[PDB]
Amino acid sequence: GTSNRDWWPNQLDLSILHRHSSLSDPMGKDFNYAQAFEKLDLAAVKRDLHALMTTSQDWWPADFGHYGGLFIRMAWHSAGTYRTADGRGGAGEGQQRFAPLNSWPDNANLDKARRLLWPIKQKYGRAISWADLLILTGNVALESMGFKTFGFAGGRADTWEPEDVYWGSEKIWLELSGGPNSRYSGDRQLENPLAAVQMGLIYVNPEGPDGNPDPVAAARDIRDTFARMAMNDEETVALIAGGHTFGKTHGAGPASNVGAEPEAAGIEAQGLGWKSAYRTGKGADAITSGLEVTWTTTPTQWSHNFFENLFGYEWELTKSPAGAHQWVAKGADAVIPDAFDPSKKHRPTMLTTDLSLRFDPAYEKISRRFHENPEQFADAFARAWFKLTHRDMGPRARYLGPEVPAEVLLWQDPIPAVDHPLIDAADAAELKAKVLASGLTVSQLVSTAWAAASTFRGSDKRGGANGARIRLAPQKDWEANQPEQLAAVLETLEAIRTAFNGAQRGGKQVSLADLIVLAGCAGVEQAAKNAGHAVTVPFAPGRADASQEQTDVESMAVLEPVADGFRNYLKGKYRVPAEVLLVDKAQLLTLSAPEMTVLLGGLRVLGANVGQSRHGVFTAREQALTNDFFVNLLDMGTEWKPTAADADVFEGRDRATGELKWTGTRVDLVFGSHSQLRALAEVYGSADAQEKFVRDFVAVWNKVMNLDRFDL
Amino acid sequence: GTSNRDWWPNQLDLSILHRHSSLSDPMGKDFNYAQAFEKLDLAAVKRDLHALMTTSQDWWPADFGHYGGLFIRMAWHSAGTYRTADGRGGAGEGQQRFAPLNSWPDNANLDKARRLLWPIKQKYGRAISWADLLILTGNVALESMGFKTFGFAGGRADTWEPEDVYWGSEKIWLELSGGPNSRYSGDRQLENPLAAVQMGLIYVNPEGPDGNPDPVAAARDIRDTFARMAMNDEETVALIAGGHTFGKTHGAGPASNVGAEPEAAGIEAQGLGWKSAYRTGKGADAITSGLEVTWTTTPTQWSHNFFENLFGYEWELTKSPAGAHQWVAKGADAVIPDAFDPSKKHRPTMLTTDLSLRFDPAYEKISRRFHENPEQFADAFARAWFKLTHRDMGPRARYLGPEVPAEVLLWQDPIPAVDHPLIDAADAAELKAKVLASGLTVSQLVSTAWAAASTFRGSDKRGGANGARIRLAPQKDWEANQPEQLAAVLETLEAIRTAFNGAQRGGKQVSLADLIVLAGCAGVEQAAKNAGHAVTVPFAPGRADASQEQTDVESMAVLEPVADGFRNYLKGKYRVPAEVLLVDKAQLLTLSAPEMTVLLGGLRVLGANVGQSRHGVFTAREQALTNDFFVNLLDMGTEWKPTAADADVFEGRDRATGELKWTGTRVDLVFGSHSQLRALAEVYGSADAQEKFVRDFVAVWNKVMNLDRFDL
Numbered sequence A, B: 001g002t003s004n005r006d007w008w009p010n011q012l013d014l015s016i017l018h019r020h021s022s023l024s025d026p027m028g029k030d031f032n033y034a035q036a037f038e039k040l041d042l043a044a045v046k047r048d049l050h051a052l053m054t055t056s057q058d059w060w061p062a063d064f065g066h067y068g069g070l071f072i073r074m075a076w077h078s079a080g081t082y083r084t085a086d087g088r089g090g091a092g093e094g095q096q097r098f099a100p101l102n103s104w105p106d107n108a109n110l111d112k113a114r115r116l117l118w119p120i121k122q123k124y125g126r127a128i129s130w131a132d133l134l135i136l137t138g139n140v141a142l143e144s145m146g147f148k149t150f151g152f153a154g155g156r157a158d159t160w161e162p163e164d165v166y167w168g169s170e171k172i173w174l175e176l177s178g179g180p181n182s183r184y185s186g187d188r189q190l191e192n193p194l195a196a197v198q199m200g201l202i203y204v205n206p207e208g209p210d211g212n213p214d215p216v217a218a219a220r221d222i223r224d225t226f227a228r229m230a231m232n233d234e235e236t237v238a239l240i241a242g243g244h245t246f247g248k249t250h251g252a253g254p255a256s257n258v259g260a261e262p263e264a265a266g267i268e269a270q271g272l273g274w275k276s277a278y279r280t281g282k283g284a285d286a287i288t289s290g291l292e293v294t295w296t297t298t299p300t301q302w303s304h305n306f307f308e309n310l311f312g313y314e315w316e317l318t319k320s321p322a323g324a325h326q327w328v329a330k331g332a333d334a335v336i337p338d339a340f341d342p343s344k345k346h347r348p349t350m351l352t353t354d355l356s357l358r359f360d361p362a363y364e365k366i367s368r369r370f371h372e373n374p375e376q377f378a379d380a381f382a383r384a385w386f387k388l389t390h391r392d393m394g395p396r397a398r399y400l401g402p403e404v405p406a407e408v409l410l411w412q413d414p415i416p417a418v419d420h421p422l423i424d425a426a427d428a429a430e431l432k433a434k435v436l437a438s439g440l441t442v443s444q445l446v447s448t449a450w451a452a453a454s455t456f457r458g459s460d461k462r463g464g465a466n467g468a469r470i471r472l473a474p475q476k477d478w479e480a481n482q483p484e485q486l487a488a489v490l491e492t493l494e495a496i497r498t499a500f501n502g503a504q505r506g507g508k509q510v511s512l513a514d515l516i517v518l519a520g521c522a523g524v525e526q527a528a529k530n531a532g533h534a535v536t537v538p539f540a541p542g543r544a545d546a547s548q549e550q551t552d553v554e555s556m557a558v559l560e561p562v563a564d565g566f567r568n569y570l571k572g573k574y575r576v577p578a579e580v581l582l583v584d585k586a587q588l589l590t591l592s593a594p595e596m597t598v599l600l601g602g603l604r605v606l607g608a609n610v611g612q613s614r615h616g617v618f619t620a621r622e623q624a625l626t627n628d629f630f631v632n633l634l635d636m637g638t639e640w641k642p643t644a645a646d647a648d649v650f651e652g653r654d655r656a657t658g659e660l661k662w663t664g665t666r667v668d669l670v671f672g673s674h675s676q677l678r679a680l681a682e683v684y685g686s687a688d689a690q691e692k693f694v695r696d697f698v699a700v701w702n703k704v705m706n707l708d709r710f711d712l
């Protein structure tokens, strides 16, 4: 069947805002995974998982009769899709059990890994998510082979359809770089937001850059793809050496033997794939990467044997049975155990990407420190493992169960405890009134509250107003946040805070993070009153103020908005049409198209635009909450033409007189161009729509103010 | 950005079951369109509409200073997408304003039509759907120009994203037949369920079959396409002559002057398209179809000029200014007014398809009767116009407003009015008790009430259990419905109904239509109890029994399920894979992926399979409401392979022993193969999920029993 996407390939795709509907979710609408998981017998699951580790199934026999390695690869892949650029991928959604991830090349035979876990999933049911299970299984594999994990958090709720993610433009799996959809430019610049070197790879090519077996080169890819997945040099080394401490690769024969990935397989494959015609096609004849490396002498036990082999040998270029570039210790004793035949033994082996830890100068200082001190190694790897598998879970208030590390880590963008009485309705009222009495404008209040709350992304549940980090580096010096304006607003708000807090009894006081949002709420009430409408904007206190010290300034950089359709803001020129970038920002803010539309409309007329630009400000009554944006946008009496100066700026002229009425961007005009968006603009541009616009707007305003409030 | 479709195009698409969610809908989830339209001043709109008829706009000047003709083609096009095969398309959903219909070649310049209607839409807001306005405007165009309409029902609710319709496989707009994706094979067989002869056309080519101007061949395509949109010869001729009594075609210059269809237009065109570079682009210079025909001396007035001109001249093949095949009267005077210059008249002209009404033997006779008896012409066209525009609104209880025809039309599959008191709860109990005492099996009861209820489709809101049409021709003789068993079940139910009704006073009685559904419920209560669950199934009485005479046998034949995955029924071998046909039927039944999963699960184990086939009956306790289907399907203990005899039947063998456990169809297994459906299967095959599965299935059962119950 021919689709709108066939006919009109370049059109906005809005479907991405409308995933995770009550329709696709088989759980009741009242279902709460947190409440389900906090009555789970976590101990009882881990015992089942421990037993599993050494209970081989003939359809996928365990290497060394212990699955631990397989399950560490599986949990590491589940978490290793994650890009800091957008916070998309990661373990958090369990998105490995769905297309495309479930059928990537790098995720080959993890289908068997998950299939092994069905009977434990089946047993415990809704009380443990697949998403929690995939991580917990990795943690139990490590514990079962004598490694102390740093902790575990439940509360990764299952999703029920594929995340809509940009994995790349490439139309061939594992396509080498230089192609018609090359993700590499310049001096090997990997394109944002991508954090892999090839379509269907987790991070880098184990044979080396585009198969070139040079461990210096490879280290460039490893540093890059890992920095892009939140991991520094030390964390990278800990994670690679720590993992490649366990199990083995599988390359027993040619790759040509392997059949269709799960999404392509027969119906009768019941969701498995890479069915192999090579001998038994499993256990000792298993093909997965096509490489045949077994790293340590105790593949099913925590050791420091990896770095021992690594440093204690010289290494020779060789080819797996599948024809794949790997390395073998030159003139070594057959010390490494076979996985299935106790009589055979193999020389030590390495990937190009393992030698990277040795031959990259900066990795080598870290690798040698860990070699000499396997207790430093074991602590790094544990911390790195925790971070890896919890990077995308959001604030510590989400973390469920009895194994949550009590140590607060910098990467968790931590929020101080609240020790004191919160402000009540009467207080909120008093403070809103004080904000307005100050002389702060609707536009200053609404712009500040927006800049603060709009850093949130449900992708990795980072950002949001909580913690007042807009007052700190680097949020407070972001172009989009109008630094000098922000400075005055905040300096004014902090006087109101100091006064209010100074007058209080019973140790009651208000965070600056509460007041920035209260102020932005005062501004929306004033704006409604400006349009002759008395509304109360909802407000939930209990935010706290993170310090500059509680804030990693490097980790904060990916949360900088460089496109904000809601502030008619572009920082530079992009391949991507601004309107596509708008749908992106809206996805991250968790907004439906109806919510995106009502929100952008109100903001334009509230003066939320960056630099008080007139683009999209389709009102004569600015700082009044009205549906002017839509009425004016959809007015056939106006005619719209691209400017001579700027093709992405438009003049709206009276169709009769040729009088200039309005200017606007693609972000503004798309609401009267896009079939489905115009349809929505129409509802809010209709005569009967003043009440519904104001009501919907306060709603999606409150939703964005509360995006990062998991403490409720 | 490569997607899951790009990688795996043949993979089932569940998104079609998860459209029309509360997420994409901008109206609150309490919003009732019926109650907004019941408060609407219908008169005030029709008044505003009448004014519009002759309020020309610079940007699309009205032909003859009256838009009536343009608005009648806009109405007819909204309704003209309808196929009887699946009831999809039609005017019921205002789908013309969305891709792809909004950008079809045959809807060229109708963007302008809809645009003209904005200010009225804007005025009356939510109280009139776009869907109701497009048809109402068509009606007021006819009333304006002196044609009395049979009437008008409102209550077509606006949709908010594209319906997911198969319009064909061609990847070139208007592609002629015999292409790599031809919708025609053999002796010009149009592939079901398509009702147009080329991609982006309503019914036929106006130049004639694949641009060949033979009005005798053209006649065949018209008879076919209109047949396929619910219209016999009499209604067809009434409708073509009815329409082409008004307005003109637009072919002022060559089609190459016409630019991007709306969906492809730049953002500045604000949702309009086909911008022409010929002269002024509009009015006298209008290109739409590239044909230049005016049929009547009075294009803005109801006449009997059409048949007059048709029969009154011999016709001469010529070419529009665009190079298109049309016809011009031989040696006729210029009696036809120009639309813009009083100083010009033109000879009478016709389309190849207009001449079809004359040169087709069967059409000629109805054309002659209409010529001779213009009172019959008028009445036929009035009825065929009401049918065209109300075909897909479903049962008469859905019809809102003061202008609803009192006259009950065979094509509306009418339901008699309930005169008498309904069975109460006490009565239902006593009836379910007698059903179960009869010795009707669970399988018999669930099969029958499924057979009845599941004929329903929300596409065109036809079918369902109301009317007990399962007891009539042709439903009672359908293969899917197991004629002989059905005979015996109904026979027994009627004895019970006859006894119950015979006992009663105050003139209370139960329809057979009610009792069939009640017994299905009794069946489902018995199956719960067989599984040791105490369940009551909800049951709403009020169904009535249609007579044979109230049931068009021919029109009922498009509701015959040649595929029902819910009964593992396929009538023969289809190019389309059965699992697609299952999804197809789920959409038609208004079912979510979860609801389809739950329902098929229960039905399998309840004995609802055609011919008592084992295919997918994964349980040892048949006729007991359990999640056996899911637990057994997802049992990794079982290996599945296609049979030698049938690639479409599968064997479930113990992975250890080789002993056959099960057989399944593609429909059974797809739940173990599709990654999103398997996700769903897993929830219901879990060990905590036996109660949830029963409740979820009683819910979707009672939904399907109530699908056609707009009388509530």
Ligand code: HEM
Pocket (backbone or CB within 6 Å): A063, A067, A068, A069, A070, A071, A072, A073, A076, A203, A204, A205, A206, A222, A239, A240, A242, A243, A244, A246, A247, A248, A249, A250, A251, A287, A288, A289, A290, A291, A351, A353
């Ligand atoms: C540059 C980074 C990395 C590369 C190129 C890499 C590459 C590979 C390759 C090619 C395999 C063979 C898969 C097979 O054939 O079945 C493998 C296996 C494995 N990797 Fe990685 N890996 C990397 C990082 C990591 C990390 C961070 C972890 C864990 C924290 C990890 C844990 C494992 C484990 C446990 C296996 C063995 C699975 C089994 O027992 O069957 N790797 N790796």
Ligand code: HEM
Pocket (backbone or CB within 6 Å): B063, B068, B069, B070, B071, B072, B073, B076, B203, B204, B205, B206, B222, B239, B240, B242, B243, B244, B246, B247, B248, B249, B250, B251, B287, B288, B289, B290, B291, B351, B353
């Ligand atoms: C075989 C069936 C039909 C064919 C091939 C056909 C073809 C055409 C064509 C080519 C146009 C010119 C479009 C343009 O250039 O603007 C047109 C106009 C029109 N048709 Fe049809 N038509 C058919 C049936 C009908 C029916 C059933 C109706 C109404 C019930 C209808 C009502 C009209 C009207 C009102 C216009 C005039 C639009 C205007 O004045 O701007 N047609 N038709």
Ligand SMILES: [Cl-]
Pocket (backbone or CB within 6 Å): A026, A027, A028, A031, B692
């Ligand atoms: Cl539930």
Ligand code: NA
Pocket (backbone or CB within 6 Å): A082, A087, A088, A089, A090, A092, A392, A458, A459, A460
């Ligand atoms: Na994420």
Ligand code: NA
Pocket (backbone or CB within 6 Å): B087, B088, B089, B090, B092, B392, B458, B459, B460
């Ligand atoms: Na329909």
